[PDB]
Amino acid sequence: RPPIHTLRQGFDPADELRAAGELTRVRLGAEHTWLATGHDVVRQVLGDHTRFSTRRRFDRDEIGGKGVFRPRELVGNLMDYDPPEHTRLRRLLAPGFTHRKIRRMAPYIEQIVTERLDEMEREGSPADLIELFADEVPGPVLCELLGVPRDDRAMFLQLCHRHLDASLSGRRRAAAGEAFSRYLVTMVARERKDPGDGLIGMVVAEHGDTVTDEELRGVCVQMMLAGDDNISGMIGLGVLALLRNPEQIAALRGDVPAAERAVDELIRYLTVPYAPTPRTAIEDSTVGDQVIKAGETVLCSLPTANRDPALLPDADRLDVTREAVPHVAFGHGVHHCLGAALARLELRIAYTALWRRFPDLRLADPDGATEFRLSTPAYGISRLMVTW
């Protein structure tokens, strides 16, 4: 019943997913799409921002293009944007995501990670690493990214949690949306009067009169949606991967270059997103061996692409010591993950700190079943009991 691109077995793409061709037509459930699994063909699809569109459309209706109405729920979602509109928004947001600016967040990330590790120690072992650490680190970090006032963060995160809660429907969902929107209206008004030092403040100081309040409010929701599940998934899965490959933990207790090498290897090997935004062909183009017809959709399996032998040899193995390779876990092209550096940093800090606090960290029950996080937009672990 579940679609083929969502299928996993342990840390790996499922055999069924691995058996599919480089580029074939599949049926979801009922929709019909192209599934691209090869590294080459995924890069060809993702590097093409002029013959493919990512803008969600309704009824089938103009495919790509400029100045089409966009529903509230998608304003400020860069992934739903085509150039030239994508190009505008990305350029406005880019200056907040450099290596230099993201490097400045290091002390705060260390603080957040330390506060969470403290909770674990206070709770005592055995402890659930997911609930106390993995699910708890990303929110505050994204707050800092945005420049949500330090003292507003607890209420901000709860309002946000309810709004992005897929389990809610009807009035409870609508009210969660209304409430969060109430805070973000206040936040944008605060920023319009005295621009802060995070992302929202940066944008109003430089481009104030040309950017809208809706856009700034949308940017806030969409950053939270883009940067939470992926990080919590990586922390959970990455810890399990390292614990089950204990010899490779030593790469997180050496110098920074080696811990950076371990992080990007874990990102490739675990590949938490199942797929980037579906692409719709605007005009006919050849991808790999096949003609993809206008109006047809393409879905890229990022995990399989990151197991392609053309990317690296011994690709189904975890090896933290190796040089970084041009994997597609963050995607490729103009939509290439805007938070890439932040993700890399966040994760490096969290892994390093965890083993610094708990050198002899172990699985509470290594012979028990693993509760994987299923039916979400990002693979992960929902519960992971640990001792120290």
Ligand code: HEM
């Ligand atoms: C390891 C964790 C992460 C992974 C694996 C990941 C992966 C990806 C991928 C594959 C895309 C491409 C989507 C597409 O082309 O359709 C993307 C886009 C994006 N990511 Fe991430 N991401 C991660 C963490 C983050 C974080 C921490 C942020 C910060 C908020 C973030 C913000 C974004 C944004 C804003 C985009 C849209 C960029 C655009 O469309 O131009 N991501 N990410």
